[PDB]
Amino acid sequence: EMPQPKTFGELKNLPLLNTDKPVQALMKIADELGEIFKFEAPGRVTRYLSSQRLIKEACDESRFDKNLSQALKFVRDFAGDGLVTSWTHEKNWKKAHNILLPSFSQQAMKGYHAMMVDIAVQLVQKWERLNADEHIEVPEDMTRLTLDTIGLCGFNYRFNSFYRDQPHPFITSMVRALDEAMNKLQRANPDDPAYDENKRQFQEDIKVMNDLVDKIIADRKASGEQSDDLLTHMLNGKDPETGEPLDDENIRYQIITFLIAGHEITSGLLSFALYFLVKNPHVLQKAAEEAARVLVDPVPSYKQVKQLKYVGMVLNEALRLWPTAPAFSLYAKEDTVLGGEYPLEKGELMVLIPQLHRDKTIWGDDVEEFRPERFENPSAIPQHAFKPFGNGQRACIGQQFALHEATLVLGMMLKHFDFEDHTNYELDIKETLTLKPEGFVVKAKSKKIPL
Ligand code: HEM
Numbered sequence: 035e036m037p038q039p040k041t042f043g044e045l046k047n048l049p050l051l052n053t054d055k056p057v058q059a060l061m062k063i064a065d066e067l068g069e070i071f072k073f074e075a076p077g078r079v080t081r082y083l084s085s086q087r088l089i090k091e092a093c094d095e096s097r098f099d100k101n102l103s104q105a106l107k108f109v110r111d112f113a114g115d116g117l118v119t120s121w122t123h124e125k126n127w128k129k130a131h132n133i134l135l136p137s138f139s140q141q142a143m144k145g146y147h148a149m150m151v152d153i154a155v156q157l158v159q160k161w162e163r164l165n166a167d168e169h170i171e172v173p174e175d176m177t178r179l180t181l182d183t184i185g186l187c188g189f190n191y192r193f194n195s196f197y198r199d200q201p202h203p204f205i206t207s208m209v210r211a212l213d214e215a216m217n218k219l220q221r222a223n224p225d226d227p228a229y230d231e232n233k234r235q236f237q238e239d240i241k242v243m244n245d246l247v248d249k250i251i252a253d254r255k256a257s258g259e260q261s262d263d264l265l266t267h268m269l270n271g272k273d274p275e276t277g278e279p280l281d282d283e284n285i286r287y288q289i290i291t292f293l294i295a296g297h298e299i300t301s302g303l304l305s306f307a308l309y310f311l312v313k314n315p316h317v318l319q320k321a322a323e324e325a326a327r328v329l330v331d332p333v334p335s336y337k338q339v340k341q342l343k344y345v346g347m348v349l350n351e352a353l354r355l356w357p358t359a360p361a362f363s364l365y366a367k368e369d370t371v372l373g374g375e376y377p378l379e380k381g382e383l384m385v386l387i388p389q390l391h392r393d394k395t396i397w398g399d400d401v402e403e404f405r406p407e408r409f410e411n412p413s414a415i416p417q418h419a420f421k422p423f424g425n426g427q428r429a430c431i432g433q434q435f436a437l438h439e440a441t442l443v444l445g446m447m448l449k450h451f452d453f454e455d456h457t458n459y460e461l462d463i464k465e466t467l468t469l470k471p472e473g474f475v476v477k478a479k480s481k482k483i484p485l
Pocket residue numbers: 100106117118119131184291292293295296299300303357358359360361362363421422423424425427428429430431432433435436
């Protein structure tokens with residue numbers, strides 16, 4: 035019989051996720067129950083997988099396909115049939131996947147690099163301009179970086195996050211829609227009048243996002259400009275299979291999807307990376323030495339960012355410990371037995387990435403230690419042991435983008451500043467649909483290296 039955490043009568047396990055930190059709650063359950071536990075909610079059953087042994091099987095795409103978790107299903111209300119919230123069998127998935135893959139390749143990063151540098155330099159400049167008495171709100175600034183980077187590379191839009199403390203109206207709505215999607219996970223009687231105004235606000239936020247993104251698309255189509263951004267690629271792309279381009283609605287969903295992905299999901303990586311760097315000065319020194327040796331020019335080149343191997347290891351080790359897209363869902367395409375012990379019927383598994391990444395049978399007993407050297411040789415990483423970007427054809431299309439922007443800015447941060455964990459910050463991971471070291475603050479003392 036499969037382990038299952040404590041239940042709450044008719045609510046089954048659902049109230050276990052009625053907590054500020056559900057991923058961490060699930061990790062704790064995984065620690066207690068092991069590599070697989072059943073999680074039941076009213077009208078839902080899933081099985082949380084935490085071991086590489088089981089997850090490797092779940093990642094067999096011949097047996098399991100991506101499932102929309104309840105979170106993804108609720109985000110689908112505004113991310114539509116964008117790539118993240120589409121089922122693999124939906125026409126728009128493969129179509130957009132085929133169209134967008136070349137826009138997200140490592141080679142495509144060469145084209146986004148200058149725009150990424152634009153924002154990265156703004157980040158560096160912000161911190162260069164802080165007064166000595168001041169500190170950095172790390173996740174906030176990382177989000178400024180990542181949001182602005184995806185805005186610029188996504189559709190040549192400047193969110194200008196370094197010019198405001200208040201979020202862009204689209205982001206206000208996106209964050210509130212994501213929050214409402216996450217809140218609806220715990221909503222008994224959704225059509226109750228208590229959650230009534232949440233619905234009105236949710237629809238208003240969906241409309242804000244649609245109107246703003248639709249206007250972006252329409253403005254680009256009307257202007258005819260051919261930027262080297264994702265929007266241009268989507269407006270001009272043709273899926274070789276169907277022969278079809280994405281329609282404007284799906285492009286809007288893709289843009290919404292990229293903005294969600296490139297917001298705190300991506301900035302969390304940077305925030306956790308910097309968190310671990312300041313908590314592990316030996317690592318920081320090693321990463322800083324690489325940044326200093328490699329980033330010999332006032333602005334990093336693409337080729338230099340590629341040489342930031344140890345920065346990449348830092349990022350991978352941050353992704354190991356706190357993958358900011360911490361779970362993905364799969365479903366059994368047919369009846370199948372998982373791991374020789376768990377018969378599954380056709381039709382859900384949750385891959386609990388932080389737990390996979392703590393599988394001592396893969397990583398050794400020191401799984402909680404931040405040791406980028408674990409990633410010194412990518413050959414040492416067994417298949418499916420490390421899956422911060424998900425799996426297979428449903429893996430993160432933005433992986434190279436996220437890692438390039440993260441490596442670039444982290445490299446620049448490490449080149450340009452020494453960092454002080456001046457509050458001896460106690461890791462407190464705030465959960466939305468992503469993870470963030472909430473309140474993580476540092477001081478950055480400029481090395482006074484010009485840009
Ligand atoms: C550190 C940053 C990121 C992490 C950890 C991450 C993680 C993931 C994961 C785990 C998935 C699979 C989700 C699932 O199976 O349900 C995914 C999918 C996806 N991600 Fe990311 N992501 C990141 C950044 C980005 C960025 C910056 C973009 C685009 C601008 C992006 C776009 C996507 C898309 C479009 C998909 C769906 C791909 C498909 O199913 O065809 N992600 N991401």
